[PDB]
Design a binder for this molecule. Structure first.
Ligand SMILES: Nc1ncnc2c1ncn2[C@@H]1O[C@H](COP(=O)(O)OP(=O)(O)OC[C@H]2O[C@H](O)[C@H](O)[C@@H]2O)[C@@H](O)[C@H]1O
Ligand SMILES: [Mg+2]
Length: 336
């Protein structure tokens, strides 16, 4: 709410991400499923998962250095894992952290490049933690630059880091406030068509038997889905995904945000737009903590802190630290 990149947008963004992670984590599903159990949320009994742990470390690094510092951020990721390994980290990425904890590893980007036979991870862990990049950086150029670099600390495949860029761009656009769904999608599509024309990206996708321009292809499917009658959960999962791959989760989160910009008759009117976006995301099943954390980041940035319900927020572990960090990003980087 209010001006582009306002404090309310910053706070709502990180709160929305925290809500999606914590509320989503129960069901790691059917719209009726979800509605019964948000009943519960009507202190800090909902633990956050690796999505929030890594987002907090990313943001703490940015604040400590008042800039992107790959060595600081890589070590804060590794030390966060060492301090609290049981947050549900991906099976592969834990190898990166263990290599980064070795004090004689001195290029912090190389462990990620060794992952998965030297092709790199395409998991959504780079995207799940990236919203803080869009709070720290106002220009599109800087959002893409450091969304990519922050993601490359663990996700060296263009299929992974282009998902992180796409998530950061969506948060970036949402922080600018009111827009049509079609304009929001169109801007995202243009940026991704630009990135997926790159040779390394084309090959990375070739090598795995994928569409050329996989993110672009899914963003076009979102535009079709937004015009389609009687869209079912099954159709959404089939065309976009609900999985741990960034390309099976990041477009899906953006779809959830765009679809839920308007009221949905099968979700009670008593829920506001942020809540309805989270309820819809979680109803898709699959990687619910991560799809909801990403949809919640976007919706929180767009709708602002006035749509973060206190009862839901106060159920989440660390909600006050999350808020402090949002306020600090606004002070340090948005220079209020
Ligand atoms: N190149 C690849 N080839 C085959 N499988 C892959 C590849 N890349 C990723 N995977 C599969 O993808 C998995 C994850 O890739 P990882 O890099 O370990 O971790 P993340 O940080 O992305 O995990 C993010 C999630 O973890 C948290 O629970 C959050 O809630 C998110 O849901 C691998 O174990 C592989 O099965
Ligand atoms: Mg997850």
């Amino acid at each position: 709410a209010g001006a582009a990149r306002s404090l309310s947008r910053f706070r709502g963004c990180l709160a929305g991400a925290l809500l999606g992670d914590c509320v989503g984590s129960f069901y790691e599903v059917d719209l009726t499923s979800v509605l019964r159990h948000v009943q519960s949320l009507e202190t800090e009994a909902l633990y956050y998962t690796a999505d929030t742990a890594m987002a907090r470390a990313l943001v703490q690094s940015l604040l400590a250095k008042e800039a992107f510092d790959e060595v600081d951020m890589a070590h804060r990721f590794a030390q966060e894992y060492k301090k609290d390994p049981d947050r549900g980290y991906g099976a592969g990425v834990v190898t990166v952290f263990k290599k980064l904890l070795n004090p004689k590893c001195r290029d912090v980007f190389e462990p990620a490049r060794a992952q998965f036979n030297g092709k790199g991870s395409y998991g959504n862990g780079g995207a799940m933690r990236v919203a803080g990049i869009s709070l720290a950086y106002s220009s599109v150029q800087d959002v893409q630059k450091f969304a990519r670099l922050s993601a490359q600390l663990t996700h060296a495949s263009s299929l992974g880091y282009n998902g992180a860029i796409l998530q950061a761009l969506a948060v970036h656009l949402a922080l600018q406030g009111e827009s049509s769904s079609e304009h929001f999608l169109k801007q995202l599509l243009g940026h991704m068509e630009d990135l997926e024309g790159d040779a390394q990206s084309v090959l990375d996708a070739r090598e795995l038997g994928m569409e050329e321009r996989p993110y672009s292809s899914r963003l076009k499917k979102i535009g079709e889905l937004l015009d389609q009658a009687s869209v079912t959960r099954e159709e959404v999962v089939s065309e976009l995904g609900n999985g741990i791959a960034a390309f099976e989760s990041v477009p899906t989160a953006i779809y959830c945000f765009l679809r839920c910009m308007e009221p949905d008759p099968e979700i009670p009117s008593a829920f506001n737009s942020l809540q309805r976006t989270l309820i819809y995301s979680i109803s898709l099943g699959g990687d619910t903590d991560t799809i909801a954390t990403m949809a919640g980041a976007i919706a929180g940035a767009y709708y602002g802190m006035d749509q973060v319900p206190e009862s839901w927020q106060q159920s989440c572990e660390g909600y006050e630290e999350t808020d402090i960090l949002a306020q600090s990003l606004h002070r340090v980087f948005q220079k209020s």
